[PDB]
Structure formats: structure tokens, C-alpha cells
PDB file of C-alpha atoms in Angstrom:
ATOM      1  CA  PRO A   1     -12.528  24.449  16.324  1.00 18.54           C
ATOM      2  CA  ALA A   2     -10.915  27.915  16.374  1.00 17.49           C
ATOM      3  CA  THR A   3      -9.069  28.642  19.650  1.00 14.21           C
ATOM      4  CA  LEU A   4      -8.154  32.251  20.514  1.00 13.19           C
ATOM      5  CA  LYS A   5      -5.112  30.949  22.426  1.00 13.90           C
ATOM      6  CA  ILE A   6      -3.732  29.998  18.958  1.00 13.49           C
ATOM      7  CA  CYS A   7      -3.850  31.898  15.611  1.00 13.52           C
ATOM      8  CA  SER A   8      -4.571  29.609  12.614  1.00 14.82           C
ATOM      9  CA  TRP A   9      -2.270  29.911   9.553  1.00 13.58           C
ATOM     10  CA  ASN A  10      -5.346  29.284   7.395  1.00 12.62           C
ATOM     11  CA  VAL A  11      -5.381  33.090   7.258  1.00 14.49           C
ATOM     12  CA  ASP A  12      -4.600  34.437   3.794  1.00 16.69           C
ATOM     13  CA  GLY A  13      -1.822  36.410   5.520  1.00 20.32           C
TER      14      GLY A  13
ATOM     15  CA  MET B   1      17.785  43.190  25.470  1.00 24.61           C
ATOM     16  CA  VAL B   2      15.219  42.228  22.806  1.00 24.95           C
ATOM     17  CA  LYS B   3      16.319  41.604  19.197  1.00 25.38           C
ATOM     18  CA  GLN B   4      13.924  41.631  16.226  1.00 23.49           C
ATOM     19  CA  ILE B   5      14.891  39.236  13.399  1.00 26.57           C
ATOM     20  CA  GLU B   6      13.367  40.216  10.013  1.00 24.30           C
ATOM     21  CA  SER B   7      15.241  37.488   8.088  1.00 22.62           C
ATOM     22  CA  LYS B   8      16.792  34.056   8.562  1.00 25.77           C
ATOM     23  CA  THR B   9      20.140  35.611   7.697  1.00 28.03           C
ATOM     24  CA  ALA B  10      19.981  37.728  10.863  1.00 30.51           C
ATOM     25  CA  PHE B  11      18.599  34.684  12.728  1.00 31.68           C
ATOM     26  CA  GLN B  12      21.878  32.852  12.184  1.00 32.16           C
ATOM     27  CA  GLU B  13      23.884  35.959  13.123  1.00 34.74           C
ATOM     28  CA  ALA B  14      21.848  36.344  16.313  1.00 34.58           C
ATOM     29  CA  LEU B  15      22.361  32.710  17.318  1.00 34.47           C
ATOM     30  CA  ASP B  16      26.097  33.232  16.832  1.00 33.68           C
ATOM     31  CA  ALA B  17      26.005  36.518  18.802  1.00 35.31           C
ATOM     32  CA  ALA B  18      24.303  34.892  21.815  1.00 36.79           C
ATOM     33  CA  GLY B  19      27.197  32.415  22.022  1.00 39.80           C
ATOM     34  CA  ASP B  20      26.559  30.017  24.946  1.00 40.70           C
ATOM     35  CA  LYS B  21      23.744  32.172  26.387  1.00 42.01           C
ATOM     36  CA  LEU B  22      20.209  30.772  26.329  1.00 39.97           C
ATOM     37  CA  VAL B  23      18.202  32.066  23.324  1.00 40.99           C
ATOM     38  CA  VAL B  24      14.391  32.061  23.196  1.00 41.85           C
ATOM     39  CA  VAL B  25      12.563  32.808  19.903  1.00 41.03           C
ATOM     40  CA  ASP B  26       8.914  33.972  19.741  1.00 41.32           C
ATOM     41  CA  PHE B  27       7.125  33.246  16.403  1.00 43.13           C
ATOM     42  CA  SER B  28       4.014  35.211  17.377  1.00 44.75           C
ATOM     43  CA  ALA B  29       2.135  36.833  14.485  1.00 42.02           C
ATOM     44  CA  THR B  30       2.222  40.616  14.837  1.00 37.84           C
ATOM     45  CA  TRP B  31      -1.064  40.811  12.878  1.00 37.72           C
ATOM     46  CA  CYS B  32      -2.713  38.392  15.333  1.00 36.74           C
ATOM     47  CA  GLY B  33      -3.949  40.447  18.302  1.00 37.65           C
ATOM     48  CA  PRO B  34      -4.146  37.545  20.812  1.00 39.14           C
ATOM     49  CA  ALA B  35      -0.494  36.680  20.055  1.00 37.30           C
ATOM     50  CA  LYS B  36       0.912  40.232  20.003  1.00 37.29           C
ATOM     51  CA  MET B  37      -1.028  40.909  23.195  1.00 38.73           C
ATOM     52  CA  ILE B  38       1.154  38.265  24.928  1.00 38.93           C
ATOM     53  CA  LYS B  39       4.347  40.119  23.931  1.00 39.75           C
ATOM     54  CA  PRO B  40       4.587  42.065  27.284  1.00 40.27           C
ATOM     55  CA  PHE B  41       5.489  38.950  29.266  1.00 40.58           C
ATOM     56  CA  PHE B  42       7.927  37.780  26.578  1.00 43.24           C
ATOM     57  CA  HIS B  43       9.383  41.274  26.141  1.00 44.31           C
ATOM     58  CA  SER B  44       9.190  42.146  29.872  1.00 47.07           C
ATOM     59  CA  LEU B  45      11.148  38.972  30.808  1.00 49.00           C
ATOM     60  CA  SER B  46      14.087  40.268  28.728  1.00 46.88           C
ATOM     61  CA  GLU B  47      14.918  42.549  31.683  1.00 46.00           C
ATOM     62  CA  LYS B  48      14.055  39.769  34.165  1.00 44.88           C
ATOM     63  CA  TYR B  49      16.645  37.426  32.642  1.00 42.96           C
ATOM     64  CA  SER B  50      19.044  39.928  31.085  1.00 45.04           C
ATOM     65  CA  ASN B  51      21.451  36.971  31.096  1.00 45.97           C
ATOM     66  CA  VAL B  52      19.242  35.347  28.436  1.00 46.65           C
ATOM     67  CA  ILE B  53      18.687  36.689  24.896  1.00 47.73           C
ATOM     68  CA  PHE B  54      15.017  36.946  23.751  1.00 48.78           C
ATOM     69  CA  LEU B  55      14.269  37.123  19.966  1.00 48.81           C
ATOM     70  CA  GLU B  56      10.953  38.192  18.418  1.00 50.28           C
ATOM     71  CA  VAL B  57      10.073  36.742  14.974  1.00 48.83           C
ATOM     72  CA  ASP B  58       7.175  37.678  12.664  1.00 51.02           C
ATOM     73  CA  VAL B  59       5.782  34.722  10.720  1.00 52.20           C
ATOM     74  CA  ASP B  60       4.444  37.334   8.275  1.00 52.49           C
ATOM     75  CA  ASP B  61       7.486  39.680   7.880  1.00 52.68           C
ATOM     76  CA  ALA B  62      10.005  36.969   8.869  1.00 51.72           C
ATOM     77  CA  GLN B  63       8.195  34.063   7.201  1.00 51.67           C
ATOM     78  CA  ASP B  64      11.610  32.906   5.950  1.00 51.65           C
ATOM     79  CA  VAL B  65      12.546  32.035   9.553  1.00 50.14           C
ATOM     80  CA  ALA B  66       9.188  30.395  10.303  1.00 47.93           C
ATOM     81  CA  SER B  67       8.960  28.565   6.966  1.00 47.71           C
ATOM     82  CA  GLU B  68      12.302  26.887   7.733  1.00 48.88           C
ATOM     83  CA  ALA B  69      10.902  25.565  11.042  1.00 51.02           C
ATOM     84  CA  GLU B  70       7.585  24.501   9.435  1.00 52.77           C
ATOM     85  CA  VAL B  71       5.598  26.391  12.081  1.00 51.83           C
ATOM     86  CA  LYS B  72       2.053  24.997  12.121  1.00 53.11           C
ATOM     87  CA  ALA B  73       0.558  27.448  14.656  1.00 50.92           C
ATOM     88  CA  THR B  74       1.308  30.677  16.597  1.00 49.95           C
ATOM     89  CA  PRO B  75       2.314  31.782  19.096  1.00 52.87           C
ATOM     90  CA  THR B  76       5.205  29.255  19.137  1.00 52.88           C
ATOM     91  CA  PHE B  77       8.320  29.596  21.294  1.00 52.43           C
ATOM     92  CA  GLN B  78      11.593  27.862  20.299  1.00 51.82           C
ATOM     93  CA  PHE B  79      14.701  27.531  22.442  1.00 55.88           C
ATOM     94  CA  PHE B  80      18.194  27.614  20.920  1.00 55.97           C
ATOM     95  CA  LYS B  81      21.589  27.280  22.563  1.00 55.75           C
ATOM     96  CA  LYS B  82      25.055  27.428  20.950  1.00 50.03           C
ATOM     97  CA  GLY B  83      23.107  27.554  17.668  1.00 51.79           C
ATOM     98  CA  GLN B  84      21.394  24.284  18.729  1.00 46.24           C
ATOM     99  CA  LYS B  85      17.628  23.789  19.202  1.00 48.49           C
ATOM    100  CA  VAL B  86      16.937  22.223  22.633  1.00 47.67           C
ATOM    101  CA  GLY B  87      13.169  22.844  23.111  1.00 46.55           C
ATOM    102  CA  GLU B  88       9.880  24.109  21.566  1.00 45.31           C
ATOM    103  CA  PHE B  89       6.211  24.441  22.538  1.00 48.21           C
ATOM    104  CA  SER B  90       3.004  26.206  21.418  1.00 44.92           C
ATOM    105  CA  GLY B  91       0.111  27.795  23.341  1.00 45.06           C
ATOM    106  CA  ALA B  92      -0.552  31.288  24.733  1.00 41.36           C
ATOM    107  CA  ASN B  93       1.053  30.372  28.116  1.00 42.59           C
ATOM    108  CA  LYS B  94       3.558  33.075  29.189  1.00 43.71           C
ATOM    109  CA  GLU B  95       4.259  31.370  32.551  1.00 45.10           C
ATOM    110  CA  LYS B  96       5.485  28.365  30.572  1.00 43.74           C
ATOM    111  CA  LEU B  97       8.356  30.454  29.247  1.00 43.16           C
ATOM    112  CA  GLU B  98       9.575  30.949  32.776  1.00 45.92           C
ATOM    113  CA  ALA B  99       9.745  27.206  33.457  1.00 46.82           C
ATOM    114  CA  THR B 100      11.605  26.291  30.252  1.00 44.48           C
ATOM    115  CA  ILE B 101      14.105  29.157  30.769  1.00 46.51           C
ATOM    116  CA  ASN B 102      14.739  28.005  34.337  1.00 48.12           C
ATOM    117  CA  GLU B 103      14.972  24.469  32.993  1.00 47.34           C
ATOM    118  CA  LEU B 104      17.680  25.427  30.410  1.00 49.78           C
ATOM    119  CA  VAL B 105      19.267  28.312  32.396  1.00 50.77           C
TER     120      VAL B 105
END
């Protein structure tokens, strides 16, 4: 479900 | 040249500075390696199309710019012209930038 081509915003940031 | 926007306030000033020139905006996350790693094509193209203005935006340090556009994923490229948005797409595809620029050049 996690694609390296895209960074997920689910990150705490 | 490349222009780094750290706030939406400068984003509006940059759009006004470009005037009628094409303006591409990269919302890549600087903290995300896969996205920052794609910056050479985005940044390198600035000298390839010096007649086009390329902006780099940090969703983490320039989250005010990204929050306004409701970005759902990075890297995301947005095209602006005359202060008007005319295109947007997501995906780590640097060649894609070349086609949209040629399409709006």
C-alpha cells in the first residue's frame, strides 16, 4: 500500500 | 533561475513576478528522500527552460502554501500562469514535467 514513488502525509511531519 | 518559496506570501509575489511566463511549482517534501532525490531534473530543467520560472515548495517548511492547495500526496507539481492555475499532477515522473511545460509553453 506504500509506494516509494509517493511520500504519504500520514507521517507525523 | 530557481526560486524557493517559504511562505504563501512569497508565493503570490512570485506568481506576480513571473508575469505571463510559465510557472511550475514542486511540492516535494525535503524530508522525503525519494522526492528530494528527484529535485535534479526539476532544478536542472530551470537552465533548460530559462524562459520558464521553476518554484520549489516544502510541504513541511512551506505547509502554508501546500495546505491552501489541499495537497494529498508528494511529490506534486502544479502549473500556474498569469497567477492562474492551468494544470497539476502527482507521481515521481520527471519526464512528465517536460511534456506539460511543452504543452503550456
